[PDB]
Design a protein around this ligand. Structure first.
Ligand SMILES: NC(=O)c1ccc[n+]([C@@H]2O[C@H](COP(=O)([O-])OP(=O)(O)OC[C@H]3O[C@@H](n4cnc5c(N)ncnc54)[C@H](OP(=O)(O)O)[C@@H]3O)[C@@H](O)[C@H]2O)c1
Ligand SMILES: NC(=O)c1ccc[n+]([C@@H]2O[C@H](COP(=O)([O-])OP(=O)(O)OC[C@H]3O[C@@H](n4cnc5c(N)ncnc54)[C@H](OP(=O)(O)O)[C@@H]3O)[C@@H](O)[C@H]2O)c1
Lengths: 1102, 75, 76
C-alpha cells in the first residue's frame, strides 16, 4: 500500500483533523489569541468513557482533562510545553451526550489561561482549569533501569486484586480502565512504586491523536494507591484533584511502566510524582505533583457504614398457603390451657391422630424424658406442638418464671434432638411473647424462649424449630390451619383472625425513628425547617438548645418573622447561596430582647428590636449579633417591622442609595404586586418616579391598574421591552429593579437609556454565570448586583443602618406600609404553597405563637446524651465494653459516672481510672451484684448524691457460659440469665423508686448480643437471656419510660472495631428506635448459611 | 481496497466534514443559540477565487456570501 | 481578571470603550459579591447630559485652582 500513500497525495474531500476529546477548534476574532474547542465526552460518542464510573455512574476522570490540557498547549503556543496548576472541580457525570467547551487564552507571552466548562440548562459549570507554558526548558529526566527498578521492588500487587478493592469505596474501573497489570513495591520507608501499565487492546486501536490516553494516565494514578503507606493511612475514597506540572517529552504509545513516588501521605490526601517510562526506561511523560484527596469525607463514610450495619425485625401481614400423627405437649400441668384443649380438638377434627403429654415443672424430668422418647419410637409422627403455660402483670415474677420456662425448654429440646428415627417438626407456641403490632404490650415469661428456638433451629435443623406467637382472641380452628399447611417460616405471629410473619431487614430510618417531644411555646427552643427540600409536607417543627448569648450577640424573643421569596426557594431546594450551604428559613424578625451577651452597651434587655440573622427566624427565640439588630421606633411594632425590613431595605438600598432615584425619571419594577414590588412602588412614588410595572397574573395586572398605575405589562415575556419603548416614544426607562431572568433580564438592560441604572436583585442569573453582553453599556449604564443576605455577613453595619432607616421612614409615615397578610406559624407551609403559586399579594407575616401553649416538636441530634449537668450509671463498667464507654463518656463531657461490677477493679482497670480521675471528671466506683436489689438502689443514690440528676443508664453487665444443647445445665442458665435480666428489673425499679433525680433520665440502654437474633450454635443460654431483655426493653418503652437495646457483634479490643461502636452507640441513643442490631454483615458465612436455611432472612440472599 | 479498509478498521485518524468556505463550526456556550464558523477564502485554499477580480485585484464575489448564508441556515 | 480581583465592595469603573463596543459577553458570576459595574463615556455625556459635564469640569477647575488637587506632569 505504497500506491495507497501516493494515491492519497492527490485528491481532497472537504474535512479537517480534530482531537478526539477537545473537538472542533475555532480561534476567536479578537486580540489576544483566544481559542475555543467544543467536543463531546459522551458515552455514545466515546463508549470507553463509560468504563470509569463512581457509584454506578459514568463520570469524566481527572486524566481526561490532563490530556485536554496537554493537547491544548501545542495549538496555542506552537512549541514544546508544560501544563501548570491543573485543577479539577465538579465531577462531570456523563450521558449519551455531554458537550464540553475547552478554552485557552493567551494572557502573557508563552503563557495561557486554560479552561474546561459545561453549559446545560443555562448553568455554566467550570469542570477544569490550568495555565499553559511554552517558555519552559526541556530538562528531560534521566532514564531508569527498568529491570534494576523491578529488582528493588519485589512485593507484587496484582492489578485485578487492587481494582476489586477500588469497587468497595465506590470507584469502578471497567475493561478500558484495567490498564494497570501489576504494581511492585517494597516497604513503607521506600516511597516508590514500579507499575507495569499498558493501554488495553480496544484503546491501542483508538490511540488516534492523544498526547497520552486518559485511560492510561488514569492507570498510573491507580498505581499510586498500591503503595503500602497509601493503603495504611488514607484508607477511604481517594480521587484526583489536580496536577502541579505535566510535561510530555514524546510518544506515550510505547509506554510499559510507570514510576510513582510519594511526596506526602496524610489522612486527608496523598501527593505524588509520576514518570511514565518505555521498555528502555526512558521518560515519556512526567506528571509531577499529582494530588489525590477526598471530597467524599470521612464523616459521610461512617454515616453510610452505620446504615449498612444496623438490623431490625419487621412483621408482614401474610396468608396461609397450601394444600400423619401428632403430639401436643404442655409445659404447665396445674395451669389448664384452653389453647392446648382447643388445639387437640381441632387436630382430631381435621382428621389427624393426636396424643397428649403433661410435662410440668417440679416433676421427675428423667422419667418424663424416657416416657417421651418411648412415644417417639412407638409411633412415627409428623410434628410435635410444645404449648407453654400462662401466668394468668408483675415483671419481677415474669423474670423469675422466665428462667424456669427456659430451663424446661432445654430439657424438652435435648430429647427431640436425640431421636433414632427422623426427628419430627417442632412447633413452639407462646402467649403474646413479642411485639408485632405497634399497640401491643408484650406478655413476658415466654420472651426469652425466642432466643433458644433460634439456637435450636441452627444446632439441630432436622426438626425445623418454628415459633408461633399467639394471643387470647384468635380461634383454635385458624391455629391448626398453620400447623397442617407446613409453611417454611421459623418465626410467626397471630393477632385476631390475621396472620403475621417475621422477616429480618436493615432499617436505619430517621423520620418516625427520630426522637419526638412536646415543648412550650413561651419557653423552650422551637425552630421550623424542611428535613428534605422539594417536599412541603416535610416541613417540620424542630427543637433546639436555647443557649446563653454572647459575646457581642443577643437572644431575641420573636413575636413575628417574614416569608420572603428567598424562604420559598429554600423550601424547594432552589435557593442560590455564595456560602454553598442551603440557608435556614426566615431572614428577618420582630421581637424583644431576652438576654444581652457579654458585653454590649447598645442593646439592653426588654427593648423592642427588629433584625436579621439567618439561623432560622421562624422560631420563638433567635440569637442574632449586636451588629444585626436595631431598636424599633414608637411608630412600628414587631409584626410591622417583620414585613418591612428586607423588602424596603433591598428597595431603599437599590433605588435611592445605589441608583439615586431622582424625581420624574422612569422606573421599571418587575412583579410589583409582591413584597419588594409594593415597597418599590412606595419609594418610587415618594420620589415621584414614573412607574412602569409588570405581573404574570391578569388579576395581579388589573390590580396594578386599580392602584392607579398605568403602564402594566406581562412579566413572563420580553414584550414589556418593546411595549414600554412605544409607550415612552422610544426613550425607554432610567432605572430597572430586575427580579426577572434571562431574556427578560437582558431585555431590561436593552430598554433603559443613558441614565441607565440596572439594579439586579435576581440571583439566578449571577449564580449561573450568564455572560451578559456589555454592548448596551455604550450609553453610560451602571449594573448593580445586590445580595443583602451576603452583606449581612460582609458589611453588617450597612444592613443595621439600612434596617434602621426603613423602620424610621415607615414609623414616621414617610412611606406607607404594604399588604400584610398575617399567618400562624403552623400554616407556614400553606404560605409557601400560595407564594409558590404566585397567588399572594404583598408581604406575608408569620405570627409566632405567644402564650404558653404546647406544640409537638422533633429533637434530631440536639439530644443531650453526654452532658455535665447530669449523672450516669454503667453496670459491668470495670471491664471490657463498659470500661471503654466510661473513658469515652468522661471524654465526651459527663458529670459524675457511677461505674459498677461485682468484681473489684482489675489492675489494668485501676490504672485506667487513675488517669481518668486526674483529667477533670470523676469516676465513682460502686461494687455490688446488680442481681441483688440493694445494689441498683445504692448505684442510683451514689450518682445523685453530688446534687446532679440521673440522665442515663447502660447495661453492659453479662456472664457468658456457652455450651451445646446436650450439656446445658439448669445452673448454667441461671448464671447467664441472672445479670442480664434481674439487673434490668432492679435498674428499672431503682429509677422509679428514686425521687425527682432519677425521674428525669434521657435514656436506658441494654447491651444485648446478635447471637440472640441469628442463633449462634453453642450460645443457647446466653442467647435466651438476651431475647427476654430485648422484649423487656420494648415493654419498658410501652409503659412510657425511655428504653434502648443494641445487639452487639464481635469486638476487637469482618469483626466490629472499638471506635466503630462508640460512634454507633451515640447515633442509636439520639434516635427513638427501641431494638437495634449492630453486627458485621458484608457476605458472611453464618449469614449466607442462615438465608438459605430459613425465609426469615429472605432479603439478605437477594 | 477491501483489505486497506479492514486493516484501517482499527487505526482511524479523527477528522470531521466541514463546509468549503464556512469551515470549522462551533456553537458558543451561551443563550441564545449562537453559532460561529472560521474559514479560509484565500487564493491558495480556493484557487478558483483568483478568477474573480475587480480592477485586476482578486476579490470575494457577492455570490460567496450568498452561499455562506444559505449554508448557515440548516445548522 | 480585574473584575475577579475586587471583593465585596466591588466597584468596577470601566472607562475603556474597546470591550463594550465589541459586545464582550462578561461573565456575571463574580457579581455574587455585591459588585457594581460602571460604564463611562464623557464624550457621549457631552451630548446626552451636557449640564452634568459642565458641572464636572467646573468642579475639577475649582478643586485644582483651590489646590485641593495637584496638577500632573504637563508637557507642552
Ligand atoms: N438580597 C437580595 O438580592 C434580595 C432580597 C430579597 C428579595 N430579593 C428578590 O426579590 C424578588 C421578589 O421577592 P419578594 O418576596 O419581595 O416578592 P414576591 O412577589 O413576594 O415574590 C413572588 C414573585 O415571584 C414571581 N415568580 C417568578 N417565577 C415564579 C415561580 N416559579 N413561582 C412563584 N412566583 C414566581 C411572581 O411574579 P408575577 O407577579 O410575575 O407572577 C411573584 O409575584 C425575588 O427574586 C427575591 O429574591 C432580592
Ligand atoms: O468483658 P465483658 O464481658 O465485656 O465485661 C463484663 C463485665 O461485667 C461484669 N459482671 C459480670 N457479671 C456481673 C454481675 N452479676 N454484676 C455486675 N457486674 C457483673 C464483669 O466482671 P466479673 O464477672 O469479673 O465480675 C465485667 O466487668
Amino acid at each position: 500500500m505504497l500506491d495507497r500513500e501516493l494515491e492519497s497525495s492527490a485528491p481532497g474531500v472537504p474535512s479537517v483533523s480534530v482531537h478526539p476529546l477537545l473537538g472542533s477548534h475555532v480561534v476567536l476574532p479578537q486580540e489576544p489569541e483566544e481559542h475555543l474547542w467544543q467536543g463531546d465526552v459522551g458515552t455514545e460518542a466515546h463508549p470507553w468513557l463509560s468504563d470509569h464510573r463512581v457509584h454506578q455512574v459514568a463520570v469524566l476522570p481527572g486524566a481526561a482533562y490532563c490530556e485536554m490540557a496537554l493537547a491544548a498547549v501545542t495549538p496555542v503556543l506552537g512549541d514544546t510545553g508544560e501544563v501548570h496548576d491543573l485543577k479539577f472541580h465538579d465531577m462531570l457525570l456523563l450521558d449519551d451526550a455531554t458537550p464540553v467547551w475547552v478554552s485557552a487564552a493567551v494572557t502573557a507571552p508563552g503563557t495561557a489561561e486554560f479552561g474546561v466548562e459545561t453549559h446545560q440548562s443555562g448553568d455554566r459549570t467550570q469542570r477544569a482549569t490550568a495555565v499553559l507554558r511554552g517558555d519552559v526548558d526541556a530538562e528531560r529526566p534521566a532514564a531508569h533501569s527498568i529491570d534494576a527498578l523491578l529488582a528493588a521492588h519485589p512485593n507484587r500487587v496484582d492489578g485485578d486484586e487492587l481494582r476489586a478493592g477500588f469497587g468497595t469505596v465506590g470507584i469502578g474501573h471497567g475493561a478500558a480502565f484495567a490498564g494497570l497489570s501489576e504494581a511492585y513495591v517494597a516497604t513503607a520507608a521506600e516511597p516508590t512504586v514500579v507499575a507495569a501499565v499498558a493501554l488495553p487492546g480496544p484503546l491501542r486501536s483508538g490511540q488516534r491523536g492523544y498526547t497520552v490516553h486518559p485511560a492510561l494516565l488514569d492507570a498510573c494514578f491507580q498505581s499510586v494507591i498500591a503503595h503500602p503507606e497509601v493503603q495504611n493511612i488514607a484508607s477511604g475514597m481517594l480521587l484526583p484533584l489536580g496536577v502541579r506540572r505535566l510535561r510530555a517529552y514524546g510518544s506515550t504509545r510505547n509506554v510499559r511502566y510507570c514510576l510513582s513516588r510519594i511526596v506526602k501521605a496524610d489522612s486527608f490526601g496523598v501527593e505524588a510524582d509520576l514518570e511514565l517510562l518505555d521498555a528502555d526506561g526512558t521518560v515519556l511523560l512526567s506528571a509531577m505533583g499529582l494530588q489525590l484527596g477526598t471530597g467524599n469525607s470521612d464523616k459521610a463514610e461512617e454515616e453510610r457504614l452505620l446504615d449498612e450495619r444496623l438490623l431490625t425485625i419487621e412483621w408482614q401481614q401474610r396468608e396461609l398457603p397450601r394444600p400423619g400423627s401428632w403430639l401436643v405437649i404442655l409445659a404447665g400441668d396445674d395451669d389448664e390451657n384452653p389453647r392446648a384443649a382447643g388445639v387437640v380438638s381441632a387436630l382430631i377434627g381435621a382428621g389427624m391422630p393426636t396424643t397428649t403429654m403433661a410435662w410440668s415443672h417440679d416433676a421427675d424430668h428423667d422419667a418424663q424424658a424416657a416416657a417421651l422418647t418411648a412415644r417417639l419410637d412407638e409411633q412415627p409422627l409428623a410434628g410435635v406442638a410444645v404449648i407453654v403455660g400462662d401466668s394468668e402483670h408483675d415483671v419481677g415474677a415474669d423474670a423469675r418464671r422466665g428462667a424456669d420456662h427456659v430451663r424446661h425448654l432445654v430439657r424438652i429440646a435435648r430429647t427431640l434432638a436425640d431421636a433414632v428415627g427422623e426427628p419430627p417438626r417442632l412447633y413452639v407456641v407462646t402467649h403474646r411473647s413479642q411485639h408485632v403490632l405497634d399497640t401491643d404490650e408484650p406478655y413476658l415469661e415466654h420472651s426469652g424462649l425466642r432466643g433458644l428456638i433460634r439456637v435450636v433451629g441452627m444446632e439441630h435443623p432436622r426438626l425445623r424449630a418454628t415459633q408461633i406467637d399467639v394471643d387470647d382472641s384468635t380461634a383454635h380452628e385458624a391455629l391448626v390451619r398453620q400447623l397442617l399447611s407446613g409453611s417454611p417460616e421459623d418465626e410467626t405471629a397471630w393477632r385476631d383472625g390475621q396472620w403475621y410473619a417475621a422477616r429480618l431487614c436493615p432499617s436505619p430510618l430517621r423520620a418516625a425513628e427520630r426522637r419526638t417531644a412536646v415543648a412550650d411555646n413561651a419557653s423552650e427552643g422551637m425552630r421550623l425547617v424542611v428535613r428534605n427540600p422539594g417536599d412541603l409536607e416535610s416541613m417540620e417543627l424542630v427543637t433546639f438548645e436555647r443557649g446563653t448569648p454572647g459575646p457581642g450577640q443577643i437572644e431575641v424573643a420573636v413575636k413575628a418573622s417574614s416569608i420572603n421569596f428567598a424562604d420559598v426557594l429554600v423550601a424547594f431546594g432552589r435557593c442560590p447561596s455564595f456560602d454553598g450551604r442551603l440557608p435556614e428559613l426566615g431572614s428577618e424578625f420582630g421581637g424583644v430582647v431576652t438576654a444581652v451577651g457579654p458585653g454590649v452597651t447598645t442593646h439592653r434587655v426588654g427593648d423592642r428590636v427588629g433584625g436579621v440573622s439567618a439561623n432560622g427566624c421562624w422560631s420563638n427565640f433567635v440569637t442574632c449579633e449586636a451588629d444585626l439588630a436595631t431598636k424599633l421606633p414608637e411608630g412600628i411594632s414587631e409584626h410591622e417591622a417583620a414585613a418591612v425590613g428586607l423588602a424596603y431595605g433591598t428597595v431603599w438600598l437599590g433605588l435611592t442609595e445605589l441608583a439615586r432615584m431622582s424625581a420624574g425619571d422612569k422606573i421599571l419594577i418587575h412583579s410589583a404586586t409582591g413584597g419588594v414590588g409594593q415597597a418599590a412602588i412606595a419609594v418610587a412614588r415618594a420620589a415621584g418616579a414614573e412607574i412602569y410595572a409588570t405581573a404574570g397574573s391578569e388579576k395581579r395586572r388589573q390590580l396594578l391598574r386599580d392602584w392607579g398605575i398605568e403602564h402594566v405589562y406581562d412579566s413572563r415575556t420580553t414584550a414589556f421591552a418593546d411595549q414600554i419603548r412605544t409607550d415612552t416614544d422610544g426613550y425607554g426607562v432610567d432605572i430597572v429593579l430586575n427580579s426577572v431572568t434571562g431574556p427578560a433580564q437582558r431585555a431590561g438592560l436593552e430598554l433603559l437609556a443613558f441614565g441607565g441604572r440596572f439594579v439586579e436583585i435576581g440571583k439566578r442569573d449571577i449564580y449561573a454565570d450568564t455572560r451578559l453582553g456589555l454592548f448596551p453599556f455604550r450609553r453610560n449604564l451602571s449594573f448593580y448586583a445586590v445580595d443583602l443576605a451576603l452583606m449581612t455577613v460582609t458589611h453588617p453595619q450597612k444592613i443595621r443602618d439600612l434596617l434602621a432607616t426603613v423602620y424610621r421612614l415607615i414609623a414616621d409615615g414617610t412611606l406607607p406600609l404594604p399588604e400584610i397578610t398575617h399567618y400562624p406559624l403552623e400554616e407556614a407551609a400553606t404560605a409557601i404553597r400560595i407564594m409558590g403559586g404566585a397567588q399572594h399579594t404583598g408581604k406575608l407575616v408569620i405570627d409566632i405563637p405567644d402564650t404558653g401553649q404546647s406544640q409537638v416538636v422533633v429533637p434530631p441530634e440536639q439530644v443531650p446524651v453526654f452532658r455535665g449537668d447530669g449523672a450516669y450509671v454503667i453496670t459491668g463498667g470495670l471491664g471490657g465494653l463498659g470500661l471503654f464507654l466510661a473513658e469515652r463518656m468522661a471524654a465526651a463531657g459527663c458529670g459524675r459516672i457511677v461505674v459498677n461490677s461485682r468484681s473489684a477493679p482489675s489492675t489494668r482497670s485501676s490504672e485506667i481510672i487513675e488517669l481518668i480521675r486526674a483529667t477533670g471528671a470523676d469516676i465513682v466506683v460502686e461494687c455490688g451484684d446488680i442481681a441483688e436489689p440493694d445494689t441498683a438502689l445504692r448505684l442510683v443514690a451514689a450518682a445523685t448524691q453530688t446534687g446532679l440528676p440521673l440522665r442515663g443508664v447502660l447495661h453492659a453487665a453479662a456472664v457468658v457460659e456457652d455450651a451445646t444443647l446436650a450439656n446445658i445445665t439448669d445452673e448454667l442458665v441461671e448464671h447467664d440469665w441472672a445479670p442480664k435480666v434481674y439487673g434490668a428489673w432492679n435498674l428499672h425499679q431503682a429509677v422509679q423508686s428514686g425521687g425527682p433525680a432519677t425521674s428525669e433520665l434521657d435514656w436506658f440502654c441494654a447491651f444485648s448480643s446478635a447471637a440472640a437474633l441469628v442463633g449462634s450454635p453453642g450460645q443457647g443460654a446466653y442467647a435466651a437471656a438476651n431475647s427476654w431483655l430485648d422484649a423487656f426493653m420494648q415493654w419498658r418503652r410501652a409503659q412510657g419510660l425511655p428504653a434502648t437495646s443494641i445487639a452487639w457483634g464481635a469486638w476487637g479490643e469482618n469483626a466490629i472495631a472499638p471506635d466503630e461502636g462508640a460512634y454507633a452507640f451515640e447515633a442509636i441513643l439520639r434516635h427513638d428506635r427501641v431494638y437495634n442490631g449492630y453486627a458485621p454483615v458484608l457476605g458472611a458465612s453464618w449469614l449466607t448459611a442462615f438465608a438459605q436455611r430459613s425465609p426469615f432472612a429472605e432479603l439478605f440472599l437477594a
